[model samples]
Target chain A: PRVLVTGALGQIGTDLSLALRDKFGADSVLVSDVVEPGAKHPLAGLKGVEKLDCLDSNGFEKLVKEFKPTWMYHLPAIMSVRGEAEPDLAMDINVNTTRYALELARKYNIRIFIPSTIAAFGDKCGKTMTKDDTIMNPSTVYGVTKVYTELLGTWYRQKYGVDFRSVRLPGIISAATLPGGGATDYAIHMYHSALLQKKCVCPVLPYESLPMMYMPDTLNSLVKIMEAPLEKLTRTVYNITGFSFSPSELRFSIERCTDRTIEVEYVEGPAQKIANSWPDSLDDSNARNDWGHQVKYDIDMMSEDMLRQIPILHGLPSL
Target chain B: PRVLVTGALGQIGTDLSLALRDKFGADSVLVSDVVEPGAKHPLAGLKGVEKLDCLDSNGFEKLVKEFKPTWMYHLPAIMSVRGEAEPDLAMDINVNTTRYALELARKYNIRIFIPSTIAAFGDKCGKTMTKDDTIMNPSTVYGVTKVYTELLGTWYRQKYGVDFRSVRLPGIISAATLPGGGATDYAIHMYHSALLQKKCVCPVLPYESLPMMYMPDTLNSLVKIMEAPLEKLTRTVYNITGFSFSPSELRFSIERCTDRTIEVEYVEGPAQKIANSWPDSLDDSNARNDWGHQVKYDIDMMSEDMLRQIPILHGLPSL
Candidate 1:
């Protein structure tokens, strides 16, 4: 099957594109980023990489028509910090890109995969496990766009009979790829700091517990959801959960991995208020029951894997 | 206290402006409409009328600076039918106008009164006795704007320490002014048709039940919320109920008032879906406790009032 992925230079996009190529031949999967043809490092080597700007609706439609991919993954977005800083740009990029993608999908009759974030939940939502159909009142512009994206996707499905699917991802921790500038990036940054320099100053929600997943689990969940039978999927948006912990708990886990005590200090910032609005855990029973979604790695298992793989990948001495 | 009211020529605005002038002196109340000065009939006779466009931020800011009103009532918005026809314009006019008003209030240090609607509730919300804070997943563009208006208003109040008050008004049934392009307009139209033509053909939502209110109660609720002391109002937005009924119930009430067999028919249209998404009734205990909000007219009383007042005002024969 021919597939297309937008925002192919970002953290999730980089890993997700590689996984798609492995599953459905390198030539069959096409990747596109907003950047120019000869601008990037890793994405430049990809076989079918192209320059596709989502903001230019005509260019996007032309690309879709020319490529005619059976499956499309639209994943371009501004994170919480960037969105809060420039709301108008964020709204144009985040909201307009999704709308353009939905239009293209409807025109070409392609299956669309959109990734949402835990930022969709807001202050009004309770602290406990948030459900799939909970009231979403996102505080930040990023969260607002995410919630609107899900609603727009659902609307397209119901109104026009388009096949659209989404996964509300938690903080993704990876050794190979660096985390994006999201409010929950602290969870991933802690691991990188411990492995690289054994010290990192954390900012925002120091002891606030939040749902997170290792990179492998995140990739697996995406593949599973994308491959699941369309009829079996009850809801378009599924809240996926892997692990939950506070910054202090994560520091303890990092300390166990390294002999030296890591300097994990908290410096409160604007992101703290944004992080405080999200939930500690999510209820993914709908995903588990409908699509048989199960994560194989927990905090301990992921920590051991990170300790072994991160040092080798970075060309550092093994402990 | 000097006060500026926008959208002063709308269905609610025409009478609301008159009420404001009566309460706070004709000279103290400044009325403005987004439409041209020549467009509104009421503006011709009314003193202290000004030409102001809420979309023009600079112009609005200048007006606020010049007037420096202690309280500002922002009632400018495109109704439901018009909004459905033009979503982009609806979002811009409904959402951005409120944001502009809030910004002006922040700059000038004035209290703001924004009106919300029961259209904020949708299918996910319970059908019977919906409370002040219910699951609001509005399906229409109008509903989306209303919900976001309430949210943004609350956020501005919390973040900027600005005092903003709002009430989720039901379908306002008025005898003096005809209904606008709202989903619940069948309530008012039925009364007009019963009195004028003695036969009415209602299009859309034949059996759909929705919360509604008489004109007097709606005006009272608006004035009461604005006049309530800030200390007594715990919530920024309060759900206020006046009356509730299905299309059939309203038809029966009109028939009883006319004392004749009226030919009532339902034609399915775009409004049917919009009306279906709203609640059958509302539970507004918070409004009662917070500001002594009380409805003076029930369905029977409202029907009698409509029968008694509409013909005499319109210069038609009365029973």
Candidate 2:
């Protein structure tokens, strides 16, 4: 199916575009972003890279009409970190974009995917393990907007049969792009700091084990739910998890992979404040049982790949 | 506290405004609605019953500036069934109204109450019972928007300390206003149908049980939470339930009170489809313990009052 991915320059979008291109053929998948994709970005040489102003519904609809996309990856977002700094901007981009895209999808009969986050759960998710069907009272603007996307997108499907799909992804640790602003950003930063290894301060406490996912697992989840038949699916949003570990545990896993010792100093602040409001872990048993969701990378493989890919960012050799 | 209530002619607002006026003085409470209040409406004799277009944020802000209301009951909404029919209208009014009202609340530091619904929970909630902090994948346009209000209002408070509050109200059975278009609306309509002493076709199966509360209890839950000290409040949205019963049980209760046989036939359709997606019951222990919530009207009292009040709606003697 032809696909249109918004926020193509985002952390997920960068990797997602590349993966979707491989799946749907480069010409078949059109990636767009408000920001131009630079030379180093994934959509650099693609045949079509359109500009996207996610908050602009008219402009978005114009693009959808032109693309005639069978499916849309409505991934545009003002993620949690920057969202803390500018809540309204986050709300506008994350929420308005989802609404525009969903409505257009309704008009065009396009299957759409909007990602939810582990951030969707906070104080309401009891104990440590968050179920696919658990209470969510996310404290961050990012999570709040995502809750909007998940609910709004699903409503479109129920009310109009727009074929909306979603997954509650854990913190994605990607080797491809710089970590963006999210509560779980610490996980991504660990890989970045591990490569520039000398000293790095952890945003959260040393033993904070918020749920996280390898980029591959994150990508696989999107594809899994999008590809699954409607009859096979029981719900709109699926909670898909991979690995959960504290900075200390994650630090140790990377320590096992590299020659250098990983020292983590905890500096409690806003990021920690945001992190405290997220789930310690999640249960993706529904995702697994529904459409056979499996993770190839645990913390061990994830750390090994992070250390392996970190050098590529600096024009160095592979591990 | 000075108060301004939007959707003042709504099922809850019709009763709520009168109650607020009693608590905060008649002159201090202002009720507003898109449609002008008819002469017989509760707010008719009040000093000011402004015509509110919830979509008109500028006018709303002007009114807010003029009133300097310490508390705003942002009760305006496009409810479930009608919202299902007119998704965009629902989206525009429900969501935009919330956005406009919330920011104004932030601008004025006005404590605000946005009512959420049992429609907030769907397939994401586990079997039968819903907890305050459970997964929400609401199916209807109405519920979807209420979730937005709950999260966004909470976001406003977290970011700006605006004293935003909300409650996931169960299906409200009121004798005053016509039943709004919600899945559990049959719970409201049953009284009218029963009082007529005639067999009426129920929109849902007689065996279908949904959590419901009488109008008085709903008003109490809202006032109780809003009036409680902020320190006592631990979260932005609370799920407060009163009674859970099936149409058959409701049939039996109304039957016991009335002189005629309460013949009810199931005519399952849209409302049933919506009802099947919602939680059969809700656990409101958090609301009970948090703000000292006690339901003065169980199904027994609810039936008696509903019977007594139906006569008052048509200017007849009270039962």
Candidate 3:
């Protein structure tokens, strides 16, 4: 299937675009971001890298006409931690851009997928085991946009038969790409810090537990939901998570892999408030039941893989 | 206090503008709608009526500059039933207009009151007792917009301290003006038919129980929440309702008021789905404790008032 991925340069998008090209032919996937690929960029050799200003409806439409993609994974967004810093710009990129994508999806009869986040839930929601349908009074601008995105997608699917699908992802841990300004970046940062044998200052406390997914599970989730038969899917949005972990637990896992005591200073900051508001875990039974969604990695396994891969991906000697 | 009300030509707006004028003098309130008030318009003699296309941000901001009002009641919206017919237009008027109002409120430092509705709740929300915070997976485009309004208001209050306050209103029963394309407009239509001795064709089933409020109570709700001290207001949004009743219950009340059997044909259609998705009652203890919110009219008293006012307002002899 031909695919169009927006914001393909971000942390998840960086790997997602490559995966899509591997599955679909290289020419079958068209990747886009707000910036052009530099000569030394990882996806520089990959074809179909288009500049897309998501807020500009005409510009987005222009890309749609030329690419004529069957499935559009509109992943461009300003993450939660940075979103609080630039709320208005986040609204434009995260909210308005999704609207443009939905409008184009309807007009072109193309199936669409936009990612929602655990950030969609707030303090009002129960701290543990938030169901697929629960109180979503989000605290951040990014979360509000995701809520809007979920509602808009649901509306488009119901009002017009646009096969709209979404998954409320947990914090993703990846060694291939750097931190993408999410509240749960502490997990990924610990892995990078461990490989380099440097101390990491954590933004959240030791026991501030939140749901998370390894990068492979996160990428696989997109494919599983998108490829699921429309008849089997019970709803438009699904809550999916690989596992739940605290910063301290992750630190232990990294230390276990590195064979050294990790120097992690727990210096809580603005992101702690954001993390405190989210649920420690989410019930992804609906996803597992409907789409056969499963995770291949746990915290220990993910940390082991990250330690093993970080050196090679960064062009250092393999540990 | 100088007040500016958008969509002032609407059913709730018609009475709300007059009540605001009554409380703060006619000159203190600036009311606006897209249409020009004709010679026979109810609010024709009311000063400070201006043409406002809520979608036009420049026009909205210009009014803010000219009025320099301390308070704004931005009420323009496409209600549930009509929103289904024109979802795209509804998005523009309901969602984008709200964003503009929020931006203007932040810039001008004006306290804003935009009314939310029970439509914000969907089937997933417990049918009997939805609270100020619950699962708000709304079914209709109008409901989606109100959810957005609530979230936007909360975000603005937290981020910029814009003094954004909103009340989730039930279906309002108004005698002074006509129904404005709402799912629960059957109540108003029933009253009008009762007075004229005509059979009303109800769009929803007689047993489709939904939360409702009298016109006076609806008007009072807006005032009560807007005037409540910011500290007393624990949250940006509050749920408030007068009563909950099915069409059959309302029919009984109307028949008792007229002392005659009312002809009511219950033919359920498109609106039944919308009504069924909403809650039967909303738990509004928050509004009561925070703002001393109390309704003056119940179903029986409201029916009597509607019978008495309908004849006078429509130039018919009093019953």
Candidate 4:
């Protein structure tokens, strides 16, 4: 199927575009983002690079009509940590863009994928094994908008028969591109800091555990759901996680992968409060039962891959 | 305290403005709507009737600055039945306007009240006695946006300490202004038609039950919540309803007051499906405990008042 990926240069989008290109062939995938890809950009010289701002309705519709994509992956967003600084900007981009995309999807009969996050849960939900459906009274601008995404997507599918699918994603750990301003970004920063033989200061407390997923598994979960037939899916949104870990547990896993001792400091801040609001684990039984979801890498395996890939990524000798 | 009421000419707004003016004095309350009030408008001769549209951010803020309202009651919205016809417009008015109001509330330190609805709960919530916090996966465009209003209001209060308060209102039974295109509008139509000696066509199933509130009780709930001290409040949004009834049950009560048999026909339609998705009743213990919420009008009392008021509203002799 022909695919259109927005925010194609984002952390998840960067890797997702490559996987889509590899699966469907480069000619079948079109990548778009607010920023134009330069020569060194990971997605440079793909089938086509379109600069698309999601808030622009006309621009979004124009691309949909021209590309005539059968499937769309909308990945642009302002993450939880940064949304605290600029709430309105985050609301406009995160919400208006999703609304426009759903409208186009309804008009063109394009199947769409919008990712929700565990941040959608706050003090209202149980901190352990949050089910797919629960009380979601989020406390941040980013999480509030994501709840909008989930509800809107579900309504579109129910009312207009729009092929809308979503998953409540955990923090994504990536090797190809750095993540944006998310609360769980400490995990990604730790891997890079460890590889560079530099000490890392964690923003959350030592025991602040959260659900995390490696980039490969994150990408695979998306593909698994998109490939599943409508008959196979039980609901509009599903909870999926790779594993749960604290900053200390992650530190231990990374130490086994690196020869150098990793120095780390745990500190308290606004992000720490945000992290504490999320669940330490999620109950993803429905995703597994309905769409055959499986996690390939735990924190240890991800640490090993991060250690192996970072050296090669920087042109250093392989560990 | 000085008050500003947006959508002041609307169903709830018209009554709310008068109530506020009566309690706080005419000069203390400023009323505004997208359409200017005519000479015949109920609030036409008030202290000030400024034309204001919620989606127009500049206009809204300018009014806020000039009016300098200590309390704002935002009631503009595209009702549920109409929202189904134009989903995008419903979303724009319902969601964007609420976001803008909250942002202004945060900026100017204004105490704001944005009303949510039982429609926020769809098939995800229980059929009876839904609590203040529960699973909210709404089906209609109207309900979807209301869910956004509740979540965003909760976040603003949590993150920035904005004085944001909300209540999940049931269908309002008003004697003055006609309701827009909401699902429970049939109840109001029944009273008007009974007085006008016209037959009524019910849009929903006869047995389809829903929570409802008299306009007086509805206005009282708003005042009660706003008057409660911040330290006295426990949650951002509260579930409050006067009573619950089915179309047939409402018909029985109306006949007792009209002395004329209310002719009604129940039919199947989109509105019926929408009504079925909502809960039969709501558990409003929180509102009572937190803010001393009390219902002065039940379905029977409201029927008598609606019957007596409709004839007077039409310049006819009251019973």
Candidate 5:
């Protein structure tokens, strides 16, 4: 089956495109982004990288018709950190892009897979594993757009028969690619800091715990849900939580890997509030029951893997 | 005590202003409108006619400082019919106007009264008399704004210790002032047409039943709520119901008043959807217990009054 991925140059898209090409034939997978392929290093070697701006609905429709992809994964969105500084741009890019993607998917009868984030939660939300259908009162523009997009997708599916699936992913820690502009960049930033120097001053809440996942787990979850039979999927949107950890726990884990003490401190900032709103854990029973979701990494396992991979990627001394 | 009335020339506001002036003395009751006095008929010949716009926060502040009104009744809003045509305008005027009103009320430490409507109900909402704190899934922009305003008012009152009250008014049928742009205006229009031409072409839903009230009962309810002691009021926004009837029932009542067979036709318009979403009846026990809200005019009494007053006002033969 043919597949199309929009925002093909972004962090998730770069990895997702490679996986799609691996599953489906490299020739069958069509990759597109708003920017030129030559502008990004990762997109340089990717086959079928085309210039596709999602804001233009007519152009997008024409491209979708031409490609006639059976499956479409839309990963284009303005991150929360960027949204706070430039709300209007965030609103336009986030809402308009999703609208264009949904319209195109509907026109072509393509099964669309969209990724949602835990940023959809707010301060007033409880700390316990939040249910998939809990009350969501998002504070930021990014979260608001995500909620609206989710509603719109559901409306499209109910009103017009369209297969739309979404997963509310936690902060993803990866050694392959650098972190993008998000509240949970600290998870990746800490690993890079530990590799470069013996000690790193990580800005994180001392007692603040948040849900996170390893890169492999995130990828596996995405592919499993997409491959699952349509009847097996009970819920439209699934909240997947891999692991939860506090700053103190992370500091102890980093110290176990290295002899030197890592200076993990809480420097209060705007992103702290955004991070605090997210729950420490999420209930993924629905995902487990529906598509057999299971994770391969815990905090200790992920730390060991990161310790080995970070030094090799950054050309640092191996343990 | 000094009081200020915004939207002082509207269907309820016109009579409300005169009644307030009579009770509290002309100097104590200040009547204000966004437009000039010449724009609205009843606003003329009023002693305390001040030009005030609810959107102009600073100007509203200045007016409040100058008048020093102890109570403020904010009634300026685009009705349901106009709101459906222009959603952006509905949000801006309805939401922002309430925000500005709340801000001024908080600053002055005065009692604020806002009027809500039954338009707050929608499709997902049950057809029963929606309780005081029921789930509100408003389909129209007008209802959405009203719900938001009500929520904001409740927040302000709880957060800042500001005295705020709201009333979810049913469809108001008036013979004195012409019904403005609202979904329920057909009820009033039928009476006017019957008086002028001896027959009426009523364009509304055939099976749509809505809660409605005659002018005197509506006026009494409003005044009674405003006058009730602070502690005596039970709900922040009381669910108020007066009379319940469908378009066919209204047509039947018109037939009783006139010998000619009135042509009650159903026209599929923009407001038909809005009218369809509203509840047929409402449980207003909270209003009854809190402020002794009672309907003085049933369908028969309201029709008799309308038949008598409308012909005299229009300079036609008395029935």
Candidate 6:
């Protein structure tokens, strides 16, 4: 199937574009972002790297009609931390772009895939493993936008027969891409800090556990759920989590990886508050039962993988 | 406080304007609709009735700036049934107008009140008695807009300190106006039909029970919650419901009121599906415990009042 991946340069989108291309033919997949193409790492060898702004409805429509994509991986968004600072831009990227995608998908009869986050689950939700049908009263603009995305996708599927699929992901651990400015970035950032031989000041407490996922597992989830037959899917948005960990727990893992103790400073404030609201873990039983969702990476496996790759990806001379 | 009510001619807006006037003098409140005011019965003697289309941001801004409303009831929206047929217009009316309302509220630092509905609660929520923090994956554009309103109001309150409040109302029974083209609007339409003659065709099943509220209780809710101390409100949106009943159950009350056997036909399809998603009753302990919300009307009280007042509102002969 021909596919269009928006926000192709972002953390998930970058990898997702490559995967889609691998599955379909390289020419069958289209990757787009607002940035002008200039030999970027992901788009360097990729054929169809177009500069498409999702907010530009006419431009988006032109691209859609021209590409005639059968499926859309609409991933353009500002992460949680960035969204908090630049709300207007976040709204444009998150809500406006998603609306354009949904409307276009309906018009063109394309199956669309969107991503929600554990950030969508708040304090009002379950304290430990949040259920698939838990209440979503998100605190941040990013979370609010995801909530809207989920609703819009559900509405599109119900009203217009659009094949809208989504999963509320957890804090994703990745060695390939930089942190995406989400509140969960502390998980990724602290590891990078350990590698850089700097004292990482954690925004949240040492014991403040949060649901997390390895990036590879996130890709596995996307493809598995997307390819699941419609009959097996009970709903549009499913909560998928791989593992859970606290700052101190991850600190030990990082220390083990570096073969040296990493200095750390503890802090708490707004980011702490945001962390406090999210789930410590997720009840992905629905996903596991329905679409055969699986994860190969836990905290130890992730730390090992990160320790193994971060040194190479960042070009660090010492482990 | 000076007040502004959008959708001033709508099913709820018609009475909401009058209710606001009774509390805050008629001259103190301004009512607006998209229609040109031309000796209409509701706006005929009502002072400060103006032509204001919510889609026109300039018109809404002009009204807000000129009147300088201290409080606003942004009640304009396409209902569930109408929204399904005209999703685009519904999105504009329900979501876009709300954005305008939120922005205007922030600009003026005004206290804003928006209404959510039982339609906002879906099957994903609690089956029998949905709580204040229920999962809201509404099946209609109208419901989706309400969810967005609830989240946006929460954000505005947290971010910009906009004094915003909302209530998720059940199916509202009114003698003041006609059906608003909602899924549960059969409550009002059936009553009106019974008043007009002794026959009615219901779109939903006889046993599909839905949570409902009387118009006075709705006003009681709006004003009481709006006037509550800010510190008392732990949340932005609270589910407030009065009673619950099925079509067959309601028919008995209608028959009791008119002292005649009202012939009824049960036809279930789209409306039935919509009604099935909503809660049979709401667990609004949050509202009651937090701000001392109380309801004086039950199903019997409302049906009696409806049969008594429906004739006067529609100028029909008394039963």
Best by DockQ: 4
Choose 5 or 6, whichever is better by lDDT: 6
Query: What is residue A157's positional error in candidate 4, in angstroms?
Result: 0.4
- lDDT tens per residue, model 5, B204-248: 678788889987888888878878898997657888888799888
Q: Is candidate 2 or candidate 3 better by DockQ?
A: 3
Candidate 2's C-alpha runs over 4 A off are A39-42, A126-129, A179-198, A229-234, A253-258, A262-264, A298-319, B123-130, B187-201, B249-258, B262-265, B279-281, B297-319
| lDDT (tens digit, per residue) of candidate 1 on A1-319 | 7899999878788888888899889988988999854543445666798888899999999988999998998989989877777766776788778878987898899899999989888877665888887677777767777876776687678767889999998888876656557777776677777767756778865688888888788888888888888999998999999989888888887788677688877987777888888898999899999998899998878888887876776555577
lDDT of 3: 0.87
TM-score of each: 0.90, 0.89, 0.95, 0.97, 0.65, 0.93
- The local distance difference test score of each candidate is 0.81, 0.81, 0.87, 0.87, 0.78, 0.83
Best by TM-score: 4
lDDT of 3 by residue, A1-319 (tens): 9899999887888889988888878889999999887665779866678888888999899999988988999998888888889877887788778888999999998989999999999987787888898788889988998898899899899888999999999988788776544588777777777777778889898999999999899888899899999999999999999999998989888778767797999996788999998999999999999999999999889987888887877764445
Superposition error at B269 for model 5 (Å): 12
Residue-level lDDT tens digits of model 6 in A249-272: 998887877778988898874578
Which docking band does candidate 3 fall into?
medium
Residues A1-319 of candidate 2: C-alpha lDDT, one tens digit per residue: 8999998887889888889889878888888999887887756766878897978888888888888999888887877778889877887788777888888888888988888888777776773778876667888888888887877877777677778888888777887876554567777777777676646667788877778889998888788788898888887888888878888888888888886786767787578877777888888888898888888988999888877776877564445
* Chain B TM-score of candidate number 5: 0.95
For model 6, the docking class works out as medium
- Model 1 pairs whose backbones collide: none
Interface DockQ of each model: 0.32, 0.67, 0.74, 0.92, 0.11, 0.77
Candidate 3: residue A1 Cα off by (Å): 2.3
Q: For residue A302, what is the lDDT in candidate 4? A: 91
- Supply candidate 6's per-residue lDDT for B264: 82
- Per-residue alpha-carbon lDDT of candidate 5 for residues A171-215, written as tens digits (9 for 90 to 100): 888776764445777777777777666444445677788888888
Give one digit per residue, the lDDT tens place, for model 6 in B86-190: 877887787779888998999987899998888887777887778777678888777887788788788888888999898887888787667667888787888
**Which residue runs does candidate 3 get wrong by more than 4 Å?**
A315-318
